Curated annotation (Swiss-Prot):
SUPFAM superfamilies xref list: DNA clamp (SSF55979)
Oligomer status and interactors: Homotrimer. Interacts with RAD30. Interacts with MCM10. Interacts with UBP10.
Annotated protein name in UniProt: Proliferating cell nuclear antigen
Crosslink feature (Glycyl lysine isopeptide (Lys-Gly) (interchain with G-Cter in SUMO)) location: 127, 164
Subcellular location: Nucleus
GO molecular function, one term: DNA binding
Organism from which the protein derives: Saccharomyces cerevisiae (strain ATCC 204508 / S288c) (Baker's yeast)
Chief localisation class: nucleus
Gene: POL30
Length: 256
């Protein structure tokens, strides 16, 4: 068997709301020591990679590595319920027909069991995180979100530029221009709101607004987002889970 018991179905919900809109299928790969899943954009521009470690469950037992390939549309129909507080248990059996999702009452008098028919997806995980990034930058996830949302009103393209202590996001559309400029600093009143920056070489990449919007769906998984930028590789945006992470590797445009 396999028994992933999340304390809060909520968490698993939110994690799927990352992938939810970006992509369309997903191979979960449950190992003896947690789950990994990886979805890729249609146009192959965005990669969503997820790890949940054993610590994130209240119980977790996985005897043999199963791959569960799911339809995201389907899975979010089963999710996203009024019961975001029931103990969701993912349940599956060796050589898996379908994955079972099991939601239980506090008082154990409402047990909504679901059986999601599975999808044979050929497993081809990509390892694309780099050793060294040109610049790495972290800031509250919501700030990133208002930024992305606020600049994406202009064009379909958003330009991040990093220089000595200046993070600068720029958009240019037919309406007119827009630039949001953040500076690194530290704050006591909330530590989880300051802005760290490491600039190993300045950066100037352009990303598509569409995708950046998708990528900020994850601001609800973590108070903070880690952004690693490179000219030689796809940018990595990371939100940290209590025992794992949601990663978006976004590929810059060339000249669109």
């Amino acid at each position: 068997m396999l028994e992933a018991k999340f304390e809060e179905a909520s968490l698993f919900k939110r994690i799927i709301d990352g992938f939810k809109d970006c992509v369309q299928l997903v191979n979960f790969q449950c190992k003896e020591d947690g789950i990994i899943a990886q979805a890729v954009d249609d146009s192959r521009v965005l990669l969503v990679s997820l790890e949940i470690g054993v610590e994130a469950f209240q119980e977790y037992r996985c005897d043999h590595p199963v791959t569960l390939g799911m339809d995201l549309t389907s899975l979010s129909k089963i999710l996203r319920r009024g019961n975001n507080t029931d103990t969701l248990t993912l349940i599956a059996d060796n050589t898996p027909d379908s994955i079972i999702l099991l939601f239980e009452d506090t008082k154990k008098d409402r047990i909504a069991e679901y059986s999601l028919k599975l999808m044979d997806i050929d497993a081809d995980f990509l390892k694309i995180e780099e050793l060294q990034y040109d610049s790495t930058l972290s800031l509250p996830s919501s700030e990133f979100s208002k930024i992305v949302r606020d600049l994406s009103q202009l064009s379909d393209s958003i330009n991040i530029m990093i220089t000595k202590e200046t993070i600068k996001f720029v958009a240019d559309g037919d309406i007119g221009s827009g630039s949001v400029i953040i500076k690194p600093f530290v704050d006591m009143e909330h530590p989880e709101t300051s802005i760290k920056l490491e600039m190993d070489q300045p950066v100037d990449l352009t990303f598509g607004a569409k995708y950046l919007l998708d990528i900020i769906k994850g601001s609800s998984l973590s108070d903070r987002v880690g952004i690693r930028l490179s000219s030689e590789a796809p940018a990595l945006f990371q939100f940290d889970l209590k025992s794992g992470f949601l990663q978006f590797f976004l590929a810059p445009k060339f000249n669109d």
